[PDB]
Design a protein around this ligand. Structure first.
Ligand SMILES: [Fe+3]
Ligand SMILES: [Fe+3]
Lengths: 423, 423
């Protein structure tokens, strides 16, 4: 029965704020001139930062939690990962997918993530993972709004009945149409697959999220077709180009020309730091490229870009706890967004920009919006990122759905001293 | 009055182990065939991992904790960092250096680090930071063995009285002789500075740790002189080449030839992931090189390499909590040591290999050694790294000097559920 969040700091705002709640929504937001006393029905942010929930714009819940089953990827390569996944085929069932997806979703709830977009491989005639994920979506709805992308992993034109299966996935309820041009047999199939993807999105009124140019090939430019088609249909807001790691290898002249179109099209971009730094640059000896898309330049140009985890504890990425501040930390380093303001503003890459990517209509600490917000025990984005703080409280519909009692560290010098890693 | 560590897991060993303690030393280590009961004077590792303390082989305690004073580095560049540091000159006093060094040292104690090698800028006629650090070394001795490197930041031959000041630092007690060849005015001064560095190390019987080829210049090959001189003097074990980021840009043929000498010389290498990924590759547009030395290849060749944090909360690196598992996480990603075994064995890069780099004589969980060890609430190195676990207990001389009560996370679904991020 929470009525107020008090003593809240807000990004880009001075001072402390009080967030009033009513009927599961934010009724008003008022500045405070000092610290407010706690009381029944008040959740004290304790001068910590309050932001609208973290978002996971790109993850594969159908493959999550499978690392080491039955064997571990020892080389760490994409190739071996594919083989290790194949060895687990006998365990891939409806219940298995639901159990693993739920395990990661619980970690996400614990990490203040209330919006998740999962890709699901639909290059499977039985659509086993998709059927399982559609049930998971309904089951987790009280805690996470889950979007499902029908992802034609083996291609649309390069896989038997690929287009038919992609459309079947949409008819079953998938929220987003996926594609993977650079994986199609030819450049022509790649371009044609995008026309088919856009046609399906318009036919069913769905969003689009393409695994776009995820390859260190300076000639992989499917992103220009994604942006051009979006501009032509006037649907930029509903379109996302995931990865675009090839952009890391483009010459500057083409990239400059392309950026005009990217801005005009209004499409969204997702970079996946943890996985990109790991899987890109694998064909280089030395020097080795970083392989993340042009995040810094997109921000400078006002192009919406955000960060996803992509994989959690699977053959393609053995690590992760589904933590967005960890994803952000990696991205700030690899993209060299290390100035104070760049780091502080970093939270945008895992909150607001990701909400835009998911085309969310009810997101942000604003009057009238649902009371969905989280509290970080930190002074600002810089502090939260530097100390990799947990989510103190996650509030959804005005109710607490997760909480973390912080770790307590003590050093025993001449006298015991508490250490909080602040100066 | 601890007499035993029980239920301990050890890297590379099967099962649980009991570590007996007597007179501040490890008296014996015995395998257990099951879980042992707790009791008075027994520290229960609770099937967590027990390892010899984390080590910080490369940090600058003279510059730590100064970020944002008086202004923040907004571009994040090395150039601006130098300017921001210059603006703080009026605050650089004896007491200031001691206060800041101690602040970071407390974070290190909290993070299970009992061995630290700090570089101290001795291109200052007043040697202010060095005098302060020598007192800090004595003060922190009960918790951390601190090694001080006399670091001629502005060069030995390229700075007024550079050589005289370097020797004065040694006469005052600095443990290690530093150098920075690539920063000298000419290649010839660079090579000559190394001869002078080795001569001083032999004259005073000190270790050597060179800021070596920290630059994206494929022609910066001072590392071959460091290794050759060490081989000639038969002192490889006492010598360290820090950074060697230029090696990331060498052609493969030269690198292969060089590796024979690196192995034969027996010198140590320190990579500083967090700072290297941030400061290297700054002159590239796109693609952008990673800029970390050849860590993977050194491991494959049996060349001792380890990881340092380098900078903590300063103009050259605004982040950090002086956490070695965080440094390791970055290094595993950038160096693409992402296979299961590579990640699991990762702890070696922040424990044993770093101890070798510091030429430590009393390190490791072995009978006869001082009872210096830490307990991680994780099953193995992979688990500790993936979950970025805190140090549950840090034991020194058989006594607890630090402890962390873990954070407690709960998600409120149909029923409350504890989340520990394990599957
Ligand atoms: Fe993906
Ligand atoms: Fe350094």
């Amino acid at each position: 029965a929470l009525q107020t969040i008090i003593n809240a700091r807000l990004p880009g705002e001075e001072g402390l704020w009080q967030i009033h709640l009513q009927d599961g929504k934010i009724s008003a937001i008022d500045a405070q001139s000092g610290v407010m006393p706690i009381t029944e029905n008040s959740l004290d942010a304790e001068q910590g930062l309050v932001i609208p929930p973290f978002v996971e714009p790109h993850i594969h819940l159908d493959t999550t939690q499978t690392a080491g089953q039955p064997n571990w990827n020892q080389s760490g390569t994409l190739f071996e990962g594919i083989e290790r996944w194949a060895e687990r085929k006998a365990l891939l069932t409806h219940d298995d997918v639901k159990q693993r997806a739920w395990q990661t979703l619980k970690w996400q709830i614990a990490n203040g993530i209330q919006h998740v977009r999962t890709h699901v491989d639909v290059s499977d005639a039985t659509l086993t993972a998709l059927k399982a994920m559609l049930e998971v979506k309904q089951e987790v709805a009280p805690w996470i709004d889950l979007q499902i992308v029908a992802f034609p992993q083996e291609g649309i034109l390069s896989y038997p009945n690929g287009e038919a299966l992609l459309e079947e996935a949409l008819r079953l309820g998938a929220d987003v149409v996926g594609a993977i041009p650079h994986f199609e047999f030819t450049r022509e199939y790649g371009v044609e697959s995008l026309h088919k993807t856009f046609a399906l999105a318009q036919k069913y009124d769905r969003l689009i999220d393409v695994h776009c140019d995820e390859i260190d090939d300076e000639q992989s430019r499917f992103v220009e077709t994604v942006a051009a088609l979006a501009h032509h249909e006037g649907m930029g807001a509903r379109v996302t180009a995931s990865h675009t790691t090839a952009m890391h290898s483009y010459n500057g002249a083409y990239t400059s020309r392309l950026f005009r179109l990217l801005k005009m099209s209004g499409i969204n971009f997702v970079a996946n730091p943890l996985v990109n730094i790991h899987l890109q640059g694998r064909f280089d000896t030395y020097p080795k490229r970083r392989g993340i898309t042009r995040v810094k330049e997109m921000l400078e140009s006002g192009i919406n870009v955000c960060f996803g985890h992509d994989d959690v504890f699977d053959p393609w990425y053995p690590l992760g706890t589904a933590n967005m501040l960890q994803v952000l930390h990696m991205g700030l380093h690899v993209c060299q967004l290390m100035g104070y303001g760049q780091i502080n503003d970093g939270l945008n890459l895992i909150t607001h920009h990701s909400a835009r990517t998911l085309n969310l209509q009810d997101y942000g600490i604003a009057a009238g919006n649902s009371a969905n917000l989280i509290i970080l025990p930190a002074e600002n984005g810089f502090d939260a990122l530097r100390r990799q703080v947990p989510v103190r409280y996650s509030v959804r519909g005005g109710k607490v759905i997760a909480s973390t009692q912080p770790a307590q560290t003590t050093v025993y010098l001449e006298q015991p001293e508490a250490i909080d890693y602040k100066r």
